[model samples]
Target: GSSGSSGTAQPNAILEKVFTAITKHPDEKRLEGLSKQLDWDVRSIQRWFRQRRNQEKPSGPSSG
Candidate 1:
């Protein structure tokens, strides 16, 4: 399902599976392979990565 304009959709079962595959491998090539295995578009997987990154806070020293 589309996540509307904010693009923050709750992960579905298939997305969770893809997320696990990505977290386990953490590589673009591996993610691409997994996407193909799951019959998902590469762009969708990339969008997931982008949204995940945006939701995370920085862990290093503050730039301020």
Candidate 2:
């Protein structure tokens, strides 16, 4: 059969934890303490917060 694959992306444990971090703090500068604790590099970490912040209402590039 030429049916489409019935697979789905599994939830990642690390991602779950990172989201918790996002919840506690969305400030890029404030995450200094977390920069060392996570596996993601600065670009990725920055992207997450930027992307995360986009999901909410924003007041500016530096604040929401």
Candidate 3:
């Protein structure tokens, strides 16, 4: 099979698995570990957490 096939939208199930167990907003040190384990950029990891939280409630004018 081809790696990182662009034709489909792939969800980070692995990341989600880890995400469920930890704090919704992880620290930089935590991100570093996840980044190394998941091979994902820390930026994306942090972005995912923010987006994931929004997904949970999606209320207007939430604190940042």
Candidate 4:
């Protein structure tokens, strides 16, 4: 009975592939491209990058 999958971070193949290259921040071109490809807002993509960075660095400041 192994039931400890908290689901903290869901897997996103598209994002994962993009993130593999740069986990810090994405440029306007990339962000806009991703926005169109994912049918999401540019700001939403920015937030996603922020969240990913914070997740990796627990000691990192959570401010923008």
* Predicted model with the maximum TM-score: 4
lDDT of each: 0.58, 0.52, 0.68, 0.68
| Residue-level error in angstroms, candidate 2, position 31 | 4.7
What candidate 2 gets wrong by more than 4 Å, as runs, is 1-32, 58-64
Q: What TM-score against the true fold does each predicted structure earn? A: 0.46, 0.37, 0.56, 0.59
Model 4, span 14-35: residue lDDT tens:
5655776654567778888778
> Residue pairs in steric clash, candidate 2?
none
**Candidate 2, run of 10 with poorest lDDT:** 7-16
TM-score of 4: 0.59
Question: Which model, 1 or 2, shows the larger lDDT?
Answer: 1
Q: What's the CA error at residue 63 for candidate 2, in Å?
A: 20
Compared with the true structure, the alpha-carbon lDDT of candidate 2 equals 0.52
> For each predicted model, how many residue pairs clash, with residues at least 3 apart or on different chains?
0, 0, 0, 0
Give one digit per residue, the lDDT tens place, for model 3 in 1-64: 3566553323455456556677667788887776766678888678877787788874598676
Residue-by-residue lDDT tens digits, candidate 1, 1-64: 4454542342344455455544622467756764754567766676766676577666799876
* Error in Å for residue 60 of model 3: 15
Model 1 stretches astray by more than 4 angstroms: 1-28, 60-63
